[PDB]
Amino acid sequence: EFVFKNIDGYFKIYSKHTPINLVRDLPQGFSALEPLVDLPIGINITRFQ
Amino acid sequence: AYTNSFTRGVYYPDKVF
Amino acid sequence: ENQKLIANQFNSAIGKIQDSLSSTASALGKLQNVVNQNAQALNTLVKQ
Amino acid sequence: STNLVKNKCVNFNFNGLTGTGVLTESNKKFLPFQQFGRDIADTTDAVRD
Ligand SMILES: *[C@@H]1O[C@H](CO)[C@@H](O[C@@H]2O[C@H](CO)[C@@H](O)[C@H](O)[C@H]2NC(C)=O)[C@H](O)[C@H]1NC(C)=O
Numbered sequence: 001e002f003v004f005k006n007i008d009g010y011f012k013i014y015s016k017h018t019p020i021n022l023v024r025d026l027p028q029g030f031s032a033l034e035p036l037v038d039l040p041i042g043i044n045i046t047r048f049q
Numbered sequence: 050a051y052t053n054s055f056t057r058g059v060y061y062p063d064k065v066f
Numbered sequence: 067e068n069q070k071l072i073a074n075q076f077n078s079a080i081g082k083i084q085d086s087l088s089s090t091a092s093a094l095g096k097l098q099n100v101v102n103q104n105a106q107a108l109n110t111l112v113k114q
Numbered sequence: 115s116t117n118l119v120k121n122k123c124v125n126f127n128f129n130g131l132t133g134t135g136v137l138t139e140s141n142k143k144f145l146p147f148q149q150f151g152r153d154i155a156d157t158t159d160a161v162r163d
Pocket of ligand 1: 074075078079
């Protein structure tokens, strides 16, 4: 999981790596995402690929 | 094509403990 | 003329409702509400 | 960084967070990204130097 954000020019890049006993879809679990890195780029972004 | 992200996207809003 | 048997029943009833209080917590609502009124009154004061 | 003194009322400034009080060592545990603690009333209660 790679939650992203862009507030106050603080382009945060979260992450979380959790293995589960499922190979079909997202499970009925719950895992918080720690701010692995933070990128103070302060640019305007509106699209990605 | 679509699925249910049940309780996903709950991170730490701050580095405050 | 009943206090032998009926005082035994009185002891049993007061004891069993003492046990019910030991098994009851919703009754403490008044004092928990007052403690929480203090808690939010201090807490709203700090938040101000 | 000049000094660190404990158990006596001083003016502590950690990376920008300012405050007056005594610094007491505690057995609490943080997370690596987490910096300073907090109470149930928006009150600072711990700061990892
Ligand atoms: C009056 O009420 C009391 C309490 O409800 C009755 O005492 C109970 O009697 C039953 C069987 O007779 C016992 O199994 C209970 O343990 C008793 N409860 C106690 C002692 O607290 C009593 O039988 C009723 N009638 C009279 C005439 O007293």
